[PDB]
């Protein structure tokens, strides 16, 4: 494509009215208040590496009769912030991972009393070999996963 696969755009609903574009070439894409993060969002509540998105090769266990994803790539949203982010309706605690479907609205920080409302809209513009792009569908209906040493290592270099 042009260089971007996913677009995270801090929508007007959030105190930030900007648009972020995750270059399919960059994996994983880091977001936070630190310029070091591929994504730049200055939020007093946010952390240097509040959260980062990581793309992985999607592959089911088996393909009997029906032809599943086969073996393409998907984008996972990783959260490393202590303020925990919110993905649509699923909780994102420090060290969690979640599937990012085309049009994924992720809340980086939300304060009921502070009125601090944040949220980015994920928009897959380019599909760099995506089984679909981002429909997030499986036995589990939108579930939050945990992070491991592999993920922690990605941010370690950050």
């Amino acid at each position: 494509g042009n260089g971007r696969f996913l677009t995270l755009k801090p929508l007007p609903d959030s105190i930030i009215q900007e648009s972020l574009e995750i270059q399919q070439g960059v994996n994983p894409f880091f977001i936070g208040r630190s310029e070091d993060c591929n994504c730049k969002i200055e939020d007093n509540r946010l952390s240097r590496v509040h959260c980062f998105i990581f793309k992985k090769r999607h592959a089911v266990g088996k393909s009997m009769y029906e032809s599943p994803a086969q073996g393409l790539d998907d984008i996972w949203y990783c959260h490393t912030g202590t303020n925990v982010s919110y993905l649509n309706n699923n909780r994102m605690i420090q060290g969690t991972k979640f599937l990012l479907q085309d049009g994924d609205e992720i809340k980086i920080i939300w304060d009921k009393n502070n009125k601090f409302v944040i949220g980015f809209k994920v928009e897959i513009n380019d599909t760099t070999g995506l089984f679909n792009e981002g429909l997030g569908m499986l036995q589990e209906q939108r579930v939050v996963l945990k992070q491991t040493a592999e993920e922690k290592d990605l941010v370690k270099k950050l």
Binding site: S47, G81, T82, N83, V84, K112, N114
Partner: peptide, 7 residues
Amino acid sequence: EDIYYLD
């Protein structure tokens, strides 16, 4: 230190 949290 940096202590973040949201209730």
